[PDB]
Amino acid sequence: GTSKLKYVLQDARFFLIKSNNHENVSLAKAKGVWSTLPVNEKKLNLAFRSARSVILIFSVRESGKFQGFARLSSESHHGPIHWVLMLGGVFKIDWICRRELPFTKSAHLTNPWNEHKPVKIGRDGQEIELECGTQLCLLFPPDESIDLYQVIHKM
Ligand SMILES: CNC(=O)c1cc(-c2ccccc2)n[nH]1
């Protein structure tokens, strides 16, 4: 069902993450980590202290799809990850959904924080307004491999 997912997303903040390649998203799914540009890293650190959940929604450039979404479990930290290419700050993340969602299925959602353009459109780090981001996450196929119980107990 969707009740625990709705609880995790309650009063959350949402950010679009754009990766150059599938390899980095695959590494993030295997290792529970993400790194981003310093300008975006500053935004995510601020948001992490500010909200009960910060959700990253991932899209590989040119894929026409989102590849899943995850919750920050830490601010960025330094001191290695073989990313394909700065990306030195490393966030810990808990995956909420590792399934894909094609952009065709989100064509009815627009992001007020990006001029009400379709939510698929935006730069890496673009914030997605609460209602848009919640509805986007709810569109993904349920990921039955994930138990949100341990996620809820970090909030
Ligand atoms: C592991 N992190 C990444 O692969 C990544 C790449 C980017 C980016 C942002 C703007 C222009 C080009 C690439 N952001 N995150």
UniProtKB/Swiss-Prot annotation:
GO BP annotations listed: dosage compensation by inactivation of X chromosome; in utero embryonic development; mRNA alternative polyadenylation; mRNA export from nucleus; mRNA splice site recognition; mRNA splicing, via spliceosome; post-transcriptional regulation of gene expression; primary follicle stage
Gene Ontology CC: nuclear speck; nucleoplasm; nucleus; plasma membrane
The keyword Phosphoprotein is assigned to this record: yes
Resulting phenotype, M86A: Reduced binding to N6-methyladenosine (m6A)-containing RNAs
Residues binding RNA, per UniProt: K18, S19, N20, W34, S35, W83, D124
Effect of R123F: Reduced binding affinity for N6-methyladenosine (m6A)-containing RNAs by 9-fold
Effect listed in the UniProt record for changing L56E: Does not affect ability to influence alternative splice site selection
Effect of K18L: Does not affect ability to influence alternative splice site selection
Protein's cellular compartments: Nucleus; Nucleus speckle
PTM note: Tyrosine phosphorylated.
Phenotype upon changing S59A: Does not affect ability to influence alternative splice site selection
Keywords annotated in UniProt: Isopeptide bond, mRNA processing, mRNA splicing, Nucleus, Phosphoprotein, RNA-binding, Ubl conjugation
Signal peptide: none
Protein's UniProt keywords contain RNA-binding: yes
Example GO molecular function: N6-methyladenosine-containing RNA reader activity
Task performed by this protein: Regulator of alternative splicing that specifically recognizes and binds N6-methyladenosine (m6A)-containing RNAs. M6A is a modification present at internal sites of mRNAs and some non-coding RNAs and plays a role in the efficiency of mRNA splicing, processing and stability. Acts as a key regulator of exon-inclusion or exon-skipping during alternative splicing via interaction with mRNA splicing factors SRSF3 and SRSF10.
Record remark: domains: The YTH domain mediates RNA-binding.
Protein name per its UniProtKB record: YTH domain-containing protein 1
Naturally occurring in which organism (per UniProt): Homo sapiens
Gene that produces this protein: YTHDC1
Residues of the full protein shown: 345 to 507 of 727
